[PDB]
Each structure stands twice: as C-alpha cells, then as structure tokens.
C-alpha cells in the first residue's frame, strides 16, 4: 500500500506517534516520506546482508528477524514480514521502541538527512486530521 501524505499523517496520529517521546507528528510523516516514499511494501537489501523493511524501513540486523541476517538481534521481537503489511500497527510499535533509545530518530538515515533541521510540521499541514 502506498499511503497518501495526509492519510498517513492521520493514521500515525491514531497510532499515537504525535509527540511520542518528544517527536512531533511531522517528524514521522517526513521520515516515512524519505525512507519508503510512503510505501508499506518497500524493502532494501544492505551490504551487510541485512534488509530494511516497510514504511519506516526497519532494519533486520538490529530490529526485526527475517532469518537471513548475520548478527541479528531482533530488538523489536518481531518478524520482519510483519513490518511489510498495509496495516502500520507493527511498524509503529517497533518504531516506538527504536526511538526510545538515546539515539532517537537518528536511527532513520533518511530522516536525519532530509527531515532533521527542516520544517517538519509542513508534512502535516493542509491535512484533515
């Protein structure tokens, strides 16, 4: 599923991400935009043998288990396949645990490179929430 910008903003708000641990809703929508372009099925194989999964491109070396990644730790205690659903529930649950570490949203490279420091609120403006 490819979310519309405002569609995802509303979904993420319903999923409790607005200001979760200090991160405004705009941060999450912007992260999804540059990480997966709002595509819940997006995957990206990495050089280290891990793969990034879903709307928030959650990594198989640290966060989810895809059974094919060396040194996997499965910090989110969830199979990566669950992060490839049109239902963002599992991705949000894991994203919350990820951001609950001192590194915060810096875990998301695209967010760090294209969102951090910008007017992230613009990503939820002009939307019926």
């Amino acid at each position: 599923k490819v979310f519309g910008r405002c569609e995802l903003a509303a979904a993420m708000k319903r999923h409790g991400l607005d200001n979760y641990r200090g991160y405004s809703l705009g941060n999450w929508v912007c992260a999804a935009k540059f990480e997966s372009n709002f595509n819940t099925q997006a995957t990206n194989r990495n050089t280290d043998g891990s793969t990034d999964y879903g709307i928030l491109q959650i990594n198989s070396r640290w966060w989810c288990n895809d059974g094919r990644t060396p040194g996997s730790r499965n910090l989110c205690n969830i199979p990566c396949s669950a992060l490839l659903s049109s239902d963002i529930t599992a991705s949000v649950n894991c994203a919350k645990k990820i951001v609950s570490d001192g590194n915060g949203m810096n875990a998301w490279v695209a967010w760090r490179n294209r969102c951090k420091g910008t007017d992230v609120q613009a990503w939820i403006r002009g939307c019926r929430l």
Epitope: G16, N19, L75, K97, D101, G102
Partner: antibody
C-alpha cells in the same frame, strides 16, 4: 525461551547502597531493553528506569540521581544500584524487559536500621 | 509527570458478569496506555498494549479501548482467576507512570 530472576540482599541498612542483579536466561541481554520496577507497601508501582541497546539510560526523576542501571554481557545480567536508601525505599523490586512480556518473580527489599 | 487516575478504586463482581475499569491521563497520550494485572505474591502481567492491542496468551475476554485521555479495560464475563489488581501505565512520556490501580474482587 526467556527467563528473568532477581537476586540480592533482602535486608539493607539506611544510607547504604541497595544492589540487585537480574539474570537473563534464554537470550542475550544485547537483544532487548531492560528495566526495573518496584512496588511500595501500598500497591503503588513506580517505573525506576531502563537501559536501551545503545547503553543510554532513562531514570525516574523521583530517584534524584541515586540510581544506576548497568549491564554485563559476559554474565548476561544487568543491575540496579540505588544509593543512600531510606525506609521509603522498602518495596518489592522487579526486573522486566521493556516490552513488559518478561518479568522476574520480584524480590522484597526492606530498609531498616 | 503524567498522572493516571483509575476508577473505581475497588470493584466487586460476581463471576459471569462483565466489568469495565477506567484510567484517565492528565494529558493526551495518544494510544500509549497499557494494562497490567497483578495478584498477591506475583509479578505484573501485561494484558493489553497500546490501548487496544491484544497480547498472545491472554484470555480473549480482556479488551481495551480509548485514546487521548480516557481509556478502559473491559472483562467480558469475569472468571475467578481474574480477581486481583489492575494497573494502567503510559509510555508516551518519560518517566513512565502507573495508575493507582483498581482492585477487582468477588462480592
């Protein structure tokens, strides 16, 4: 499967440092975030703090910096150190993972002169 | 910090009947409210996470509802094994905080 178990003294003196150990069996401590929660004599629960994968810690402000949570990957254990305790620190201490799916059995610690 | 207020403080019910427990937050916390059950001489047990998400291994008679500041834990047809304490806990902001608890007992 995962198992958690608290260990340490049950009787401590006021002003001393209370130290508890949580032994994790079934998986590496590097595979989760680890927490400490305690229950006061009157059904009052307090989330003391947790340590995440990067080593960053989060402590309850109520503990006024008397708390320290550390880990030992080689022994697959993590710890709780609470300095300068008072009778207010008498409670049942539990270790559990951040998700709250795994909990230890809890251990009563009484602070008394 | 975020204060969670639970009501009633105590609830007496006859097995077979249904009950609903309330937990209200001092400020909006989205869906970041979890429910725990705790019995004498035992560690807390997670029943519902993120307001309404089910937990594997928990009886289906337990359900959660709510968002923002008002949440509820419902037990459809209470069983004797359900008597004990129930606590809500929020994870929206650090420090995580617990409600004062609701005691469910047989009447």
């Amino acid at each position: 499967d995962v198992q958690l178990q608290e260990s340490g003294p049950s009787l401590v003196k006021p002003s001393q440092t209370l130290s508890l150990t949580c032994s994790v069996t079934g998986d590496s401590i590097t595979s989760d975030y680890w927490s400490w929660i305690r229950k006061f004599p009157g059904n009052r629960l307090e989330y003391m703090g947790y340590v995440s994968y990067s080593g960053s810690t989060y402590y309850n402000p109520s503990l006024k910096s008397r708390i320290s949570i550390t880990r030992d990957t080689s022994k697959n254990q993590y710890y709780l150190d609470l300095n300068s305790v008072t009778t207010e620190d008498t409670a049942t201490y539990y270790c559990a993972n951040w998700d709250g799916d795994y909990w230890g059995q809890g251990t009563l610690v009484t602070v008394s002169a | 910090d975020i204060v969670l207020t639970q009501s009633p403080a105590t609830l007496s019910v006859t097995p077979g009947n249904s009950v609903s427990l309330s937990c209200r937050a001092s400020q909006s916390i989205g869906n970041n409210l979890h429910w725990y059950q705790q019995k004498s001489h035992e560690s807390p047990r997670l029943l519902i996470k993120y307001a309404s998400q089910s937990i594997s291994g928990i009886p289906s008679r337990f359900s959660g509802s709510g968002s923002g500041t008002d949440f509820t834990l419902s037990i459809n047809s209470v069983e004797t094994e359900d008597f004990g304490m129930y606590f809500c806990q929020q994870s929206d902001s650090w420090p995580y905080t617990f409600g004062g608890g609701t005691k469910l007992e047989i009447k």
